Amino acid sequence: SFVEMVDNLRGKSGQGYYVEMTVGSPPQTLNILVDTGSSNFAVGAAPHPFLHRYYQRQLSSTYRDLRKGVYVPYTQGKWEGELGTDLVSIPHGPNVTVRANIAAITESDKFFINGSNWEGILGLAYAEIARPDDSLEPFFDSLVKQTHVPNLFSLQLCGAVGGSMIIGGIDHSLYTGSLWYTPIRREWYYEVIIVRVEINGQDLKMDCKEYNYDKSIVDSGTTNLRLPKKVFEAAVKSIKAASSTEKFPDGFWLGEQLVCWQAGTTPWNIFPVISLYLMGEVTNQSFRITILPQQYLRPVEDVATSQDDCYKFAISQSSTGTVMGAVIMEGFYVVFDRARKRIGFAVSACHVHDEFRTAAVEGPFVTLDMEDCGYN
Ligand SMILES: CC(C)(C)c1cccc(CN[C@H]2CS(=O)(=O)C[C@@H](Cc3ccc4[nH]cc(CC(F)F)c4c3)[C@@H]2O)c1
């Protein structure tokens, strides 16, 4: 039964997608950010100006202190805390309880968001990137070990937000058309390989290893599509050329300035689609996912800006590889098939579209080139 797991995610634009979890005995309810880009389960466990509730260890009779400190520095934001174990459940997920590692966050810097409505983070990637080191078993590994739940999960993130995390199986009600799979190159992040990028159907014509310098990952905790410097600059130039009819603030393309139009007058049609071709499961085959401006120009929720419709450019520069974040994942049904070491993409029920264009997953595409596109 996955019907009860449907629509178990909530969120605000730019502030991630969260699921309700409980920790401790008796259970304490907390909202937890779903993040495929990390591997630590961590919850606020001390007062913070931006937390309206937190994990109170002294009130759980099943809490065990591991007497070990832990620190996680993200690209933006960091926290410090104390490791322990306790019982964890997902009320609107699988009907199981597991004992898992939990980092009790005691200090933090730019981690919690004012008004985000979540109080913790669930890192769904592999032990390789867990802190303090890879010996700290991640939540999903514990869940599979301790229960009969199949080793996979899927995410349907929906734009303005909500969505579904389905654990243990595939919900065919959440997508249409074909599911296309790209291999997980290595299990640490969910690392994948991009073999080609097009803007409105025009090839960026780079050596395809540049697209994966120095890795490409699928990362639900990150809002933006992040691209390696060289690829970012070229994509921005290509996108600028398409939307040349309208001029925008210099800081817009830097993600430092919003662009606003009168309510309901956003000129979506002047902006190009972006296609990412992902390595297929068969030699020299790929498939493409196509992203509309409704995805990469993300609406800002702030009430202060609500007189018009304002958007932030949700593509940004990366020094640590490509990050296919939420704006890439939104509208797609994304299957993290850990058992078969692959990630699947299909058009979801909440996929982005207007009358002329639609987000799509299409294939196969074939290349004569014999160069692998993985970096290093
Ligand atoms: C493995 C680890 C050491 C955690 C690490 C270090 C650098 C980069 C990564 C890749 N994954 C990262 C990329 S990121 O830092 O942009 C967002 C991060 C999750 C994260 C962390 C704090 C956060 N605070 C607010 C948000 C909401 C977000 F949507 F803006 C948020 C999301 C991912 O988890 C992992």
Bound ligands: the ligand CC(C)(C)c1cccc(CN[C@H]2CS(=O)(=O)C[C@@H](Cc3ccc4[nH]cc(CC(F)F)c4c3)[C@@H]2O)c1
Tally of DSSP helical segments: 4
Query: How many strands in all?
Result: 26
* CATH H-level superfamily of the largest domain: Acid Proteases
Elements, N to C (H/E):
EEEEEEEEHEEEEEEEEHEEEHEEEEHEEE
Strand order of the largest sheet: 2-3-8-4-7-6
CATH topology title of the largest domain: Cathepsin D, subunit A, domain 1
Distance between the termini: 43 Å
- Specify the overall morphology: globular
CATH architecture of the largest domain: Beta Barrel
Domain module tally? 2
Structural class: mainly beta
- What's the CATH class label of the largest domain? Mainly Beta
Largest sheet: 6 strands, mixed, barrel
Helicity level: under 10%
Provide the β-strand percentage band.
Answer: 35-45%
Query: Radius of gyration over alpha carbons?
Result: 20 Å
EC number: 3.4.23.46
Domain Peptidase A1: 17-346
Catalytic activity: Broad endopeptidase specificity. Cleaves Glu-Val-Asn-Leu-|-Asp-Ala-Glu-Phe in the Swedish variant of Alzheimer's amyloid precursor protein
Glycosylation sites: 95, 114, 284
List the helices and strands and how they pair.
Blueprint: E1 9-11, E2 17-23, E3 28-35, E4 41-44, E5 64-73, E6 78-89, E7 97-109, E8 120-123, H1 139-146, E9 153-158, E10 162-167, E11 175-183, E12 191-192, E13 194-199, E14 202-203, E15 216-218, E16 225-228, H2 229-242, E17 259-261, E18 274-279, E19 285-291, H3 293-296, E20 297-299, E21 309-313, E22 315-318, E23 322-324, H4 326-329, E24 332-337, E25 342-348, E26 360-366
Parallel strand pairs: 3-8, 4-7, 15-23, 16-22
Antiparallel strand pairs: 1-2, 1-10, 2-3, 2-6, 4-8, 5-6, 6-7, 9-10, 9-24, 11-25, 12-15, 13-14, 13-18, 16-23, 17-21, 18-19, 19-26, 20-21, 24-25
Active site: 35, 219
Subcellular location: Cell membrane; Golgi apparatus, trans-Golgi network; Endoplasmic reticulum; Endosome
Protein name: Beta-secretase 1
